Design a binder for this molecule. Sequence first.
Ligand SMILES: *[C@@H]1O[C@H](CO)[C@@H](O[C@@H]2O[C@H](CO)[C@@H](O)[C@H](O)[C@H]2NC(C)=O)[C@H](O)[C@H]1NC(C)=O
Ligand SMILES: *[C@@H]1O[C@H](CO)[C@@H](O[C@@H]2O[C@H](CO)[C@@H](O)[C@H](O)[C@H]2NC(C)=O)[C@H](O)[C@H]1NC(C)=O
Ligand SMILES: *[C@@H]1O[C@H](CO)[C@@H](O[C@@H]2O[C@H](CO)[C@@H](O)[C@H](O)[C@H]2NC(C)=O)[C@H](O)[C@H]1NC(C)=O
Ligand SMILES: *[C@@H]1O[C@H](CO)[C@@H](O[C@@H]2O[C@H](CO)[C@@H](O)[C@H](O)[C@H]2NC(C)=O)[C@H](O)[C@H]1NC(C)=O
Ligand SMILES: *[C@@H]1O[C@H](CO)[C@@H](O[C@@H]2O[C@H](CO)[C@@H](O)[C@H](O)[C@H]2NC(C)=O)[C@H](O)[C@H]1NC(C)=O
Ligand code: NAG
Ligand code: NAG
Ligand code: NAG
Ligand code: NAG
Lengths: 98, 173, 197, 344
Amino acid sequence: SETKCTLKSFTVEKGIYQTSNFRVQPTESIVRFPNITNLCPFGEVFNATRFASVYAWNRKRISNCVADYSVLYNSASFSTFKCYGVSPTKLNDLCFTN
Amino acid sequence: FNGLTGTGVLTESNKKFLPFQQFGRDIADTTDAVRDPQTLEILDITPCSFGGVSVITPGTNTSNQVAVLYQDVNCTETWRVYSTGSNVFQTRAGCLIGAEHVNNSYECDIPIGAGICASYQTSQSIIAYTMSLGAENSCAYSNNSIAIPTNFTISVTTEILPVSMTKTSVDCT
Amino acid sequence: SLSSTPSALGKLQDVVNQNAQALNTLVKQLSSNFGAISSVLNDILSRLDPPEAEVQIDRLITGRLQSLQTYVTQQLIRAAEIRASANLAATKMSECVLGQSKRVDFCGKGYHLMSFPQSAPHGVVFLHVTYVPAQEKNFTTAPAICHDGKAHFPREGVFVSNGTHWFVTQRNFYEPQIITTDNTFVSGNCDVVIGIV
Amino acid sequence: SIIAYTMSLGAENSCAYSNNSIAIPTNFTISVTTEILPVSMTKTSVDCTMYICGDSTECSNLLLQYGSFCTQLNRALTGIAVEQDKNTQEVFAQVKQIYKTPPIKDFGGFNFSQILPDPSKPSKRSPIEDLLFNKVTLADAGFIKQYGDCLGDIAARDLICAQKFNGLTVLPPLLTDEMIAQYTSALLAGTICSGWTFGAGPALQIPFPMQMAYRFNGIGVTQNVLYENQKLIANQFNSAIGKIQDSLSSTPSALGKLQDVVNQNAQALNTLVKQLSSNFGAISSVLNDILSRLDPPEAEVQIDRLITGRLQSLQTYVTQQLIRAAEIRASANLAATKMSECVL
Ligand SMILES: *[C@@H]1O[C@H](CO)[C@@H](O[C@@H]2O[C@H](CO)[C@@H](O)[C@H](O)[C@H]2NC(C)=O)[C@H](O)[C@H]1NC(C)=O
Ligand SMILES: *[C@@H]1O[C@H](CO)[C@@H](O[C@@H]2O[C@H](CO)[C@@H](O)[C@H](O)[C@H]2NC(C)=O)[C@H](O)[C@H]1NC(C)=O
Ligand SMILES: *[C@@H]1O[C@H](CO)[C@@H](O[C@@H]2O[C@H](CO)[C@@H](O)[C@H](O)[C@H]2NC(C)=O)[C@H](O)[C@H]1NC(C)=O
Ligand SMILES: *[C@@H]1O[C@H](CO)[C@@H](O[C@@H]2O[C@H](CO)[C@@H](O)[C@H](O)[C@H]2NC(C)=O)[C@H](O)[C@H]1NC(C)=O
Ligand SMILES: *[C@@H]1O[C@H](CO)[C@@H](O[C@@H]2O[C@H](CO)[C@@H](O)[C@H](O)[C@H]2NC(C)=O)[C@H](O)[C@H]1NC(C)=O
Ligand SMILES: *[C@@H]1O[C@H](CO)[C@@H](O)[C@H](O)[C@H]1NC(C)=O
Ligand SMILES: *[C@@H]1O[C@H](CO)[C@@H](O)[C@H](O)[C@H]1NC(C)=O
Ligand SMILES: *[C@@H]1O[C@H](CO)[C@@H](O)[C@H](O)[C@H]1NC(C)=O
Ligand SMILES: *[C@@H]1O[C@H](CO)[C@@H](O)[C@H](O)[C@H]1NC(C)=O
């Protein structure tokens, strides 16, 4: 039937027909991440008492924590949330290095 | 692995990464090895299959029986085989399943490869066999003897050559 | 033989089939989407505004142009094969039909006698007439005759012997002749040639 | 240092024009020369789906929009593979009778021990044939690789594993080396025992010195020259053959044309493997990174860019492979002509 489909015919002539490949399918999903238990400091970032002047803006490194953006849904309403490197729906599936 | 997805078979690696190197990549710029993010082991990753499947089919106006050749399966040494049902004949071209193995050489019909061919024979089945290159003969070497024709025949044969093909013009617009 | 065998002219049918498949391939490839929202140009023009239609149209133009270029390249290579075949056919016409060639198997198996070309759809069929040896016999031979101490060699043919008598025959046909001075030449003497009778 | 110079076209010579004088040979020599022709090239099949898509369902679904191009390329490569066996048989399938090699290897002083197969070796090849096989280097140690070995890391990064993983399949020839050697041996036995009669039809035995006498008559020299100097001629023949064996063994480039054919196909496949890694304008050369970081519509845009890239790569490969196939066909036709016209 695979050959009949390949040739778009219900009649197949005498000979040898090559028809794709024998492929082994995965049987299980194996996921590995570092055992990071700390939640990222979203409070300090979004619930800060004061923000620095734009002329003298601050930057800090975030490390050794778990990112979860659903915590902000009942915290504040955001006017802009635009991602360029990654689509928003995939943010929870990645792990970042810097 | 840490956001890097794919399908394959994991094995222990014999490679050692530098203290700062996390991933190994092949000449194709695909992942060949990963340092596991949970335990700092070096693992290799290989695709799950090479495929290499072709089907030997007689014409459908005679019989619906088929045989399948697996180019990279060593059935003599599972086996990356869809189905078996006995009739397993290993060749240098790979093992095939469904045809009978007959050791009586014969004229080739459906070529398989590496000296093996197949045909459909009558209790009908697909027969796999070693090709017969020609009839065996001999000619004596005698330094004091010759053969001379005493009779002759007129023989007429044909030769076919293409001369032309249909001329086609295409209006690309 | 020609009437009985449906595949006698298979090479010509194959040429016709290859061109028919190439054109049906172009017709079928016309229907591909090529990444566009629709394979039909009128749907794109009907539902989309100018700049969006232009993007989808450009995708279809790239698709169809690539399809035509692939067709032309394959058609040109097949044309090259036809040119090689036609040159061989013309050579066979001049060399086998308008003359007699000595080349083995060039004008058919056996020794070439003559040929008769015939026309055919998109091609030529040659009928070659050859001379083929048939019944043969085993005879004793020798490279030379020693009549009077001189070495006698045949002018033409081969020295052949039956159980009791020696003759001269043509290599391609057994007509034993008496060995005489009119079909034999003399050079050298009986002490050099091996196996002189 | 590196020296630049005007080329010498050849040695200068002259020949007097004298209306009352001729030159005539008084002696002669038997000369043995070689001619090398390609007959076939490695048969390659490509799975255009495995090559384009890394077992990605989304990639496959996009590929179906161009599926007939993938099928057409597969068909062209299949046609080439078929032609390689047709060419091989046309060069080596002119005689349908397999003649036994006589137990005698020396006929009238003519020594064929270096020409006829040696029955004591696993490979039924002559010493000269064995040397021919020991000069051309083939990367593929047969056609069955299996799934093992390639499962782990290959320290040498054996190219056949990578090529097969990307859908590039090397196919076995229809005729084996043993079959070709056997056929050729049959042709040698045919000519030695019956001269050219077996080509035209039945093989008629003729003592070898008479076949040579007929050949001399064909040259335009009386049979007397061969019979008068038979021993000298046989000695020159045997020495010329020994010279061929030494010439072939000594020169590493004697079969360069065949090595070039093998190298061209190896480079074409390594080129496809390397081209797989190009970005083609996409954010990443790896399909899984695009699927992991981007959502459906953005992944589809980057995937479409990669599909166009890989499909163009395969089409370029197929076109170049087909043109090389055309050159091989021309070579095979010349080789078959030489077989019928020079050997038979
Ligand atoms: C010519 O003589 C040879 C022998 O020199 C014949 O070949 C033999 O034929 C018989 C059958 O009649 C076989 O059994 C032998 O094995 C053959 N021997 C060989 C080839 O060495 C040959 O048939 C004779 N031909 C004619 C036309 O008389
Ligand atoms: C070889 O051929 C010769 C010539 O035909 C044969 O000798 C002749 O035989 C006939 C009888 O059949 C006689 O009438 C002739 O006089 C003979 N000729 C000569 C010159 O003697 C001879 O018999 C044949 N030999 C064999 C063994 O067949
Ligand atoms: C045959 O005669 C020609 C002259 O007609 C010879 O050619 C000359 O050879 C000498 C060397 O011996 C040269 O110096 C002359 O310049 C040649 N002259 C020519 C070519 O006009 C030739 O060598 C003689 N060959 C033989 C075999 O005797
Ligand atoms: C025919 O040639 C072979 C070589 O191809 C000769 O066999 C060689 O004989 C010499 C002694 O003369 C040995 O040292 C070599 O080792 C032999 N070589 C092989 C490959 O066997 C053979 O003697 C020659 N025969 C004749 C009659 O000249
Ligand atoms: C013709 O040339 C051959 C060589 O091609 C000569 O034969 C050799 O002659 C030398 C002496 O000059 C001997 O040492 C060799 O042993 C000979 N070789 C052979 C194989 O016999 C021959 O002398 C020349 N002259 C003629 C034939 O008249
Ligand atoms: C967590 O990861 C670190 C770093 O590899 C490792 O040393 C540690 O054992 C892991 N702990 C657990 C509980 O998995
Ligand atoms: C900020 O404070 C509010 C309470 O006023 C709390 O609900 C919210 O979770 C805090 N935000 C973060 C990011 O922790
Ligand atoms: C299978 O493996 C064995 C052991 O390496 C080998 O001898 C044999 O040739 C292989 N292939 C076949 C088709 O038997
Ligand atoms: C022919 O060969 C035999 C060996 O089979 C030998 O005895 C005989 O002398 C040779 N005759 C000639 C004329 O060469």
